[PDB]
Amino acid sequence: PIATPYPVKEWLQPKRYKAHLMGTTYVYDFPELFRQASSSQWKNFSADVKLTDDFFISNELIEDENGELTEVEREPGANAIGMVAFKITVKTPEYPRGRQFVVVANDITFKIGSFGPQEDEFFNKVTEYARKRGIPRIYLAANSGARIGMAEEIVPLFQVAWNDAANPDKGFQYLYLTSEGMETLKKFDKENSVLTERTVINGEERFVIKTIIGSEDGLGVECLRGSGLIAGATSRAYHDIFTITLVTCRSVGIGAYLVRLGQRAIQVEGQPIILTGAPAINKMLGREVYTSNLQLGGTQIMYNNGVSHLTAVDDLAGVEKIVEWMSYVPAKRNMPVPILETKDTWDRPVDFTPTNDETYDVRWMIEGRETESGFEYGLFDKGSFFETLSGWAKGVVVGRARLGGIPLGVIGVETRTVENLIPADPANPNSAETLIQEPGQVWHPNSAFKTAQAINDFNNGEQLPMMILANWRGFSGNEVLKYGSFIVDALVDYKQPIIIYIPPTGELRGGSWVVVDPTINADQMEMYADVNARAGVLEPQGMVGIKFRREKLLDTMNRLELLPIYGQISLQFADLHDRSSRMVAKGVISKELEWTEARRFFFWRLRRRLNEEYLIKRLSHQVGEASRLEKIARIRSWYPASVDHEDDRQVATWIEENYKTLDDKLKGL
Amino acid sequence: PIATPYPVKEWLQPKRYKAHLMGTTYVYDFPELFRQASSSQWKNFSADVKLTDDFFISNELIEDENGELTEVEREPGANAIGMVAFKITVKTPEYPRGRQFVVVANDITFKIGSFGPQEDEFFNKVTEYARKRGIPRIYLAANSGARIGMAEEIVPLFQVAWNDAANPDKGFQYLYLTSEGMETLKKFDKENSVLTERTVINGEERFVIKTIIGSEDGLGVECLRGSGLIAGATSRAYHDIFTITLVTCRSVGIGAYLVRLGQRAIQVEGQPIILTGAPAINKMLGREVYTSNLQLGGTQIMYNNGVSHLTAVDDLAGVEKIVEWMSYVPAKRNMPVPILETKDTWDRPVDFTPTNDETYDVRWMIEGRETESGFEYGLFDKGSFFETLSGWAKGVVVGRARLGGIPLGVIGVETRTVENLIPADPANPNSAETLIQEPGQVWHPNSAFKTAQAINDFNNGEQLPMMILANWRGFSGNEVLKYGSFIVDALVDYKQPIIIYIPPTGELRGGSWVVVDPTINADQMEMYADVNARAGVLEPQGMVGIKFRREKLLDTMNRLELLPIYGQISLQFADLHDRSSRMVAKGVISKELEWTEARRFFFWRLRRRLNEEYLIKRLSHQVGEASRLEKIARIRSWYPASVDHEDDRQVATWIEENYKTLDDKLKGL
Ligand SMILES: C[C@@H](Oc1ccc(Oc2ncc(C(F)(F)F)cc2Cl)cc1)C(=O)O
């Protein structure tokens, strides 16, 4: 393109053009996308904000002579390997003073962005660089999988010992190198390129090749080791720091695997996640079954199965989703979750309220609904709900949100009936589309798996508090059994305060309660039941049909048919047990709450709990053998004699008024 | 039964008869079953062994006044709760001096062996009693799920406020208690049994009941809490001590859940594992779909899905399987795995050997095969292989075994084609039986899940070393993706030395290698490749069709159709790369081994590694900030200047000759 206003980027560095031709952004151009997403992040928080370019800094990372990652500034496209890294320090609304994180990405323009030993080592170095600093690791997937190849320096000068040179088609016995052939390697110093054994015949000597190694690195097994390295490295990363992946062009083999290992992933439409090549798959299936790779690792597949937590219209949308996601996570490991107050204060009732005589969307309780006559506020801050895994297991809703600025993970039950339509089966010209009916408030294999996943994803890396608006009436298909224990495990491992609240029209029966009972992890869990909720081992219908047969029905009968009415009286007699009042009496819940006052209660209870948890931790550096009970008990003995321990606002208030004073007490131990 | 030789047990204590009528063993009679299994255990180890009854001791456990578990001796059937516990101290071949473990079981004769608050608390107390002492917990499942019921003391004297006493069928508004009714409760002191509000009408006062609580404990939510308690307690137990479950009569609700939470489970034929009642399921399905519960939680279902690791013809067979399983696990947490030498010494070659021109059963390589002309010894001790999860994911074989007495977990790839026949679908009169073809050396969703499970089950509680005869050529259905990371996670968590050995005719391609590469956990993992094995990113066929097209084929062609032969030359050229020799050159394996000499090598390498691991641990009590590298390096500096560090036998020999001497060195730090 001649005569253009300004210089042609795609000409100055053709690699940029190659990347675009691939349908993706040039690696070195991604940082600019983060500055834009970051800049937009401010505009949406406060339009009147004069932003200076020093609010976003990007510093590429390359290994020095000691293989140690260091910051440098060089011209794009100067990377010697197919892997690049950037250290980003940007000021955001959640962190005005600024925050940091790393970005690892494949250079799709460098050897089809394949994973070679040098690229793996680098990816591994970056990962631990982020883990060590407790910083989040963002990975941009755009690869072709593990690098492959043969010792090309042997394919031209390799000899074969046929059965008879006369009739070559008769077959052969082995391959070898001649005295000359062997000399050529010694000349290029590529002797190690092969293993042979001198053998003479009716002619001269014929060095029989027993094994080909090759002088080039990245032909086979060495690439498999590099993959395992980064695979296990990512696995550890996930339990250490915040990990997220964005599929920008395509992710193959180890690339697709890494997407799952990092767990949280956003897939850009059109960019497929391929484990094994489609063309190769048609070979292991016989006839041509698939046409394009999109039909395999497309968004309409990965996003629906839960592998892709989110999708993006394009790369910039992808970066924005990443940036928005991070707004809920701490600047770094072990750091207080990013507190962020907006126009929606904590002091206000909850407008939206579900009714037994009306279908509703759980989301309306979470963020709120917009009616024709105004906006009904929900339990959490307006527009603070960021849902994820929205294309899989619609039965349950998971997302981040804010409670008066306090970021937390939220899981709610979808009362509406889910209509999961499973596409036809390509590997079978007979089977077609299949519509599935996923009842509301009913646990399914995918629903339990999604719940466990959500819990772990909230706990690991994100380190956020959590609220589950428990509202399940049962389960059905054993996969439900297996994944079931996944949930209890995730809860035992939770390290932040948890809150289980059975919503108003909600209910919690049988094992649906067991899997989330506070006694699973009393150190972090508390359970509340709305005055309009219900809970019991069995639903009214099931109870009566067991402990209220017909003989007990007749005996009661004293109005002397009237079975229909007396029958309903049974259900009502039972229902009178599944009341929140009873829950309190039995002490199975911390207390019963009112939906409209919930927000005010939960905001202070959580703010108060976070304060004590902080203290319980600062105290976990004195006498080693100290029970958490003995810890919280000592800390509460520091409160003034007039402070009501049950008063959250007061307790939170005093503590925040004496952080240093309390610190001194700690230092004096 | 009159005139019987000896007293009639079933008469002395009718509960025994009730249990038998249930088709199960009486709880208090189970200890005797363990003495018999234990006694048989000796007969099979050494017939010439005069065993005295003091080799097996059983002491029941009940809570004292402080709720603390204590040992007592009382008449069977005197248990006040539906839960019983026994502490067993038996002398076994692996532990002549004796070993200990606990046995928790439901009393099916006590309120249909249902889980009540008192039973849950007890189950929880026993579990931690075992965890605290590091002792194994054996649970005998024979229950009816969580206890249920209503405040019966209200159903007879409860009044209803009809719309008009004239026409009761017209309906009602609420229920209440009269001045008299209220008095009756105050008389029985059951006032808390309900919550009311005095309300007067055209008549007198009518205490409207707003909530029914009941004076009896175990009606609803309190039972759900008890379940959650033991659910999360079992979950923790699994990561702490050796947990196993035996379904003796039936396990319902929380009972079935606990089976999964304890992971390792043995199901007796005929005894079903039911999550939700079948009769109730027919109600949530409309018409009668299922006839018996066996069709749901039967062995032909649980065992095939992997929930039941093993099945037993009857209870005693069940106990034997438990006893035999424990022979591979340590007396207790953190204790050296149970070393046990038999007639099959370590010093001997490996007889059985697979051939590319012959189908074989991986098991023959493991334990060996019995031919018409003698017995071909395998890699491990004869008859020491104890396979588990044998009815699910036949694609992979998992079990315990012994290497010259050294107990370890083993996983191997089933080369033969699996024929998983999925039964018809009852919830659909249209769908029938479906036969599935699971190719050998090919990873499937169930196969990866089974592998991860095996690894975790070996690591947690069992604390055993592990060997995986890696031999996978690929994978296929994404569930394979999800469960895939389950494997890498399990390896990162492994705490005992691991050994990955690609068998002779075996091979390891693509991601099949990544998921088990040593670099995933270098602290415990080592990888060996047989000289007759093959490994690479892609199989010969795939490689040539990518880096050896037709133009490269023709160019090479110098014999001037001959495509068939030249084509084969391609495959051979590539295959020459996937050789173990190359693996060594690239340093991706510790070394290449010979199948017949493997046993001798692995026996000493493992014995040597266990010795150093012990030392690396004893050293983990000195200078806190010490790298494992710095640890093993210091320990190896203690070896004599003449000892070859690479010589396992020598190293193992010296160390075992100077345990105390080394101890002194440690104490002097
Ligand atoms: C209270 C209840 O105990 C149960 C019942 C089923 C149960 O198993 C499950 N519970 C929940 C799920 C999930 F994950 F879907 F919520 C799965 C199972 Cl298998 C656990 C405890 C009972 O015994 O009635």
Ligand SMILES: C[C@@H](Oc1ccc(Oc2ncc(C(F)(F)F)cc2Cl)cc1)C(=O)O
């Ligand atoms: C070496 C290979 O990298 C891969 C390929 C696929 C891959 O994903 C999986 N690998 C193994 C399994 C399992 F568990 F079946 F063994 C599953 C997946 Cl998704 C991981 C790494 C490559 O890029 O060619």
